[PDB]
Structure 1
């Protein structure tokens, strides 16, 4: 059931993160004696919001929803790093390397394009 490039190419699924089925409500034991790492961190953005700047200083400056104009070029994928287990029991992902940036342009009402480097660099 595993897909190939000729199945995926030009469908938009290459910009998608993999999904887990609804049944996978389980739990993953972190053995404190053993080290861990992340083989692949994918991030697929669905919604980009931009905060307006009302020229008033005060007022309701809320995040307005925007329209993506740079197409299915948005996901960060193939990110690797070490998942440490700390002293106090917490896990800290340190990001090492991957496709960890995408330039994204979204467009507000009025036509203002907003370019951003959507990233999780370091």
Structure 2
């Protein structure tokens, strides 16, 4: 029971809550009782960016990056419905929460990759025949990644999607075919995949914890350039209440 004054400035506010080391129980799930995730936290620990090789066919492996936006990365306070399917699979549908964080990571060579680390509108199911949540339960699911900048964002030349100029006003007589990629902003909604691997269970309090790995795309600068594929690895915590 730490107060806010015990936490502020230290960096513990960005950490997901941990489960005790001597806790590997099973949380039973009745097929009639409805469940909720009262608190889902996702603390990322590693951002990997897929490199872009010059040749068409190569390894195309993920490389490590440096976080430059400090401890602003965790998703927390996420709530959702945990329903039991007829196959025995448990499906989590999120409703609300702090489910996105803008994150900039720096690749080697100084290049910065902005991304919207999110689980917005996550639907994540388990394999069938899960009557108790154990340390072998996995949640595979998909989420929506909206645009990094929303429609009101203005670029440095005042161009944007829902507001701003539609042309380069500082070149009043330049040809507009070459600048059509920068003049016409586009809103992108891509899809991301996440796997939540349960590692620790508290059958009494209903808390589970473990690791997650998610794949999504980075920011495209409203369609100016191609995005990079980003894999996010970290730990997670979820409080399961009977609704």
**Is the TM-score greater than 0.5?**
yes
In the alignment, structure 2 segments of 5+ residues that lack a partner are: 121-243
Deviation at 1:45, TM superposition (A): 0.1
Report 1 or 2 for greater relative contact order, CA contacts < 8 Å, sequence distance ≥ 6. Answer: 2
The DSSP-based 3-state class of the residue aligned with 1:6 is helix
Residue 51 (structure 1) shift: 0.1
Counterpart residue number, 1:33: 32
State the 4+ residue runs in structure 1 displaced beyond 3 angstroms: none
Identify the residue that residue 101 of structure 2 maps to in structure 1.
102
1:58-90: CA deviations, max 9, x gaps?
121100000000000000000000000111101
SS of 1:45's partner is strand
The Cα of 1:26 is off from its aligned counterpart by: 0.4
Cα distance between partner residues in 2 of 1:25 and 1:59: 42
Partner residue, 2:8:
9
Between Structure 1 and Structure 2, how many residues are aligned?
120
Match of 2:58 in 1: 59
The higher radius of gyration belongs to 2
Stretch of structure 1 that moved more, 53-62 or 64-73? 53-62
Cα deviation, residue 33, structure 1: 1.2
Shift of 1:31: 0.8
Q: How far 1:25 moved relative to its partner?
A: 0.4
Q: TM-score, normalised by structure 2?
A: 0.49
Q: Which moved more, 1:72-81 or 1:53-62?
A: 53-62
